[PDB]
Amino acid sequence: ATITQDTPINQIFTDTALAEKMKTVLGKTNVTDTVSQTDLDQVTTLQADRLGIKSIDGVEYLNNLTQINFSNNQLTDITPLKNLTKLVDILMNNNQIADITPLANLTNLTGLTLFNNQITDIDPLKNLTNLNRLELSSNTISDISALSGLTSLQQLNFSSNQVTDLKPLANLTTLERLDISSNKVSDISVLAKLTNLESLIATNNQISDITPLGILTNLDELSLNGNQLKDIGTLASLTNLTDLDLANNQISNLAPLSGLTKLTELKLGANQISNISPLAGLTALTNLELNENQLEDISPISNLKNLTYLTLYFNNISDISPVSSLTKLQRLFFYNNKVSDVSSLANLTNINWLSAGHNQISDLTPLANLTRITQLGLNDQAWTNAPVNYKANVSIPNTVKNVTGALIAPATISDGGSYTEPDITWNLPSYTNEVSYTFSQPVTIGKGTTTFSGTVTQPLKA
Amino acid sequence: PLGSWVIPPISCPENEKGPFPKNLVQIKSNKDKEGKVFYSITGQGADTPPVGVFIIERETGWLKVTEPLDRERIATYTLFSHAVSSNGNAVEDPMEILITVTDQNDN
Ligand SMILES: [Ca+2]
Ligand SMILES: [Cl-]
Numbered sequence A: 001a002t003i004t005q006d007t008p009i010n011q012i013f014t015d016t017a018l019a020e021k022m023k024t025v026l027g028k029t030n031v032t033d034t035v036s037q038t039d040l041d042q043v044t045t046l047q048a049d050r051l052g053i054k055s056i057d058g059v060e061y062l063n064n065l066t067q068i069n070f071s072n073n074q075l076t077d078i079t080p081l082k083n084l085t086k087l088v089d090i091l092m093n094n095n096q097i098a099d100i101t102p103l104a105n106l107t108n109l110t111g112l113t114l115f116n117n118q119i120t121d122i123d124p125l126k127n128l129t130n131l132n133r134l135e136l137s138s139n140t141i142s143d144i145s146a147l148s149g150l151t152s153l154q155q156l157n158f159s160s161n162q163v164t165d166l167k168p169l170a171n172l173t174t175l176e177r178l179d180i181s182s183n184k185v186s187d188i189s190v191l192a193k194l195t196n197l198e199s200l201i202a203t204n205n206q207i208s209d210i211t212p213l214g215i216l217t218n219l220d221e222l223s224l225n226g227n228q229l230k231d232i233g234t235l236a237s238l239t240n241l242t243d244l245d246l247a248n249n250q251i252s253n254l255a256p257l258s259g260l261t262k263l264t265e266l267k268l269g270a271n272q273i274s275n276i277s278p279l280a281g282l283t284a285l286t287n288l289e290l291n292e293n294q295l296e297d298i299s300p301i302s303n304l305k306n307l308t309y310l311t312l313y314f315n316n317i318s319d320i321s322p323v324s325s326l327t328k329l330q331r332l333f334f335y336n337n338k339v340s341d342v343s344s345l346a347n348l349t350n351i352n353w354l355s356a357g358h359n360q361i362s363d364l365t366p367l368a369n370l371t372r373i374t375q376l377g378l379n380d381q382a383w384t385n386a387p388v389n390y391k392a393n394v395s396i397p398n399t400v401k402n403v404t405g406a407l408i409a410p411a412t413i414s415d416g417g418s419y420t421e422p423d424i425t426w427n428l429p430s431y432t433n434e435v436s437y438t439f440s441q442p443v444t445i446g447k448g449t450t451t452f453s454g455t456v457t458q459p460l461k462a
Numbered sequence B: 001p002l003g004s005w006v007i008p009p010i011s012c013p014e015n016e017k018g019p020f021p022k023n024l025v026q027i028k029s030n031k032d033k034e035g036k037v038f039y040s041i042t043g044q045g046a047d048t049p050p051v052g053v054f055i056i057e058r059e060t061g062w063l064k065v066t067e068p069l070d071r072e073r074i075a076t077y078t079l080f081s082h083a084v085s086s087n088g089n090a091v092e093d094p095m096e097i098l099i100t101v102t103d104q105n106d107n
Helices: A016-025 A189-193 A211-215 A233-237 A299-303 A321-325 A343-347
Strands: A045-047 A067-069 A089-091 A111-113 A133-135 A155-157 A177-179 A199-201 A221-223 A243-245 A265-267 A287-289 A309-311 A331-333 A353-355 A375-377 A381-384 A393-397 A418-420 A423-427 A434-445 A448-461 B010-013 B022-026 B037-043 B054-056 B062-065 B076-085 B095-102
Touching (some): A189 A211, A211 A233, A299 A321, A321 A343, A393 A448, B010 B022, B054 B076
Parallel strands (some): A067 A089, A089 A111, A111 A133, A155 A177, A199 A221, A221 A243, A243 A265, A287 A309, A381 A448
Antiparallel strands (some): A393 A423, A418 A423, A434 A448, B054 B062
């Protein structure tokens, strides 16, 4: 393509925003300044992301382009790319491209980034066999047969599409990093062929059988979060794993993890785990997620001295004291458990986020010296006191203590009872099996602020 | 202002290799728990310039980075997460989120 003679920049690039950008690239003072083909023929790269471009009309005269960035714009038609056969790399994520037919003869492409578009038919990719990087997430792709001849691919991402059939991946044995998350995949048997895989991300699919992973011994990163896993026996073979995400599945038996001592991050939340003994040797762990299981005994955590992040919320834990040795902890979440004694938490001097609501905590004094705290959760405690004798008039000590050691006055007291520090008193005409009170006290520890609140049940025995 | 947010610290090495977008961390509200929860983010690098460096998967809360970073250009981003139920109700207040750009490694 050539402009016959010199033309105003704003006549070649009809897009207002692209005309401005090209005025700067082409060293001119305004958009109506004329330019020659020889000026145009100098442009070899173009960074034009984030400029509100709607049309790339004019780009066809930039004959020597090898790399372009038009990401984060409002492109629909990419026809002007069709003849730009010196293009090696294209960044075009976050546009409204529906038709990629203009890419079909760009056979020198080694990188093509097209995520976040309106792409369905990828047949125009089929002859782009020099590609080593290809990013197609967040489109409406259901057929990846066009990928089958892309035998130099090292990195491939098509997460957030509607793919069921992975068979076209079979011959892509140079793949090292693959992401197929948020598709409609159940059968990952073709993945057994991809023995060079180092990273496999496959969250939010319908995978129950992971036997095909058994020979993928080069895997260092694996994510199967949001699947239907139960038997993870195959993972024992994956001795190079350092980062493993298995959250939101149906796993109970963790024995296959026990030899995976390279692990530094391990997500196991939302499963069926009641025994974490097999985790005890994973001493390189800095992050461990165990929320939403059926844990009571967490004693096997005590040796994991490198943990800086730990989740335990939604379990059946009464004894939190195994965390006392995890002196590097910076964030600890254990909301919805049955913990009453937080004396052990005085040890976690570097703690910054402490999330402890919906437990049985009555006394904040062991937390008083934790001044690196910036986020704090103490709402909605509840516990039941040891019973006391039912009588016509019943008096109990209030036992809710603030961080200062001062008793916190009840907010409400059942059965018309009253408070005179330190005693809560009820006049009880007829026998009742229990009485109760609530408390609600804003509090700050360091720079972390919450409402320390709860409901206290007092059984009365006759 | 912690509410029911559960968020790991977030760092991203500069000069990362693809494929993009790449998972950083999975953000969670435990009202999820008692419903499906739907996530969004705001801040410089999300909805204000530079726009779209970070995005979040609405249904899963996966926070992702969309291109290579440069510590000499931006070293930290401050973002804010938001959570709502299927009925549209807000199930959390916004949470300020730091993202630290760190040494490169070939991940
Ligand atoms: Ca969660
Ligand atoms: Cl909490």
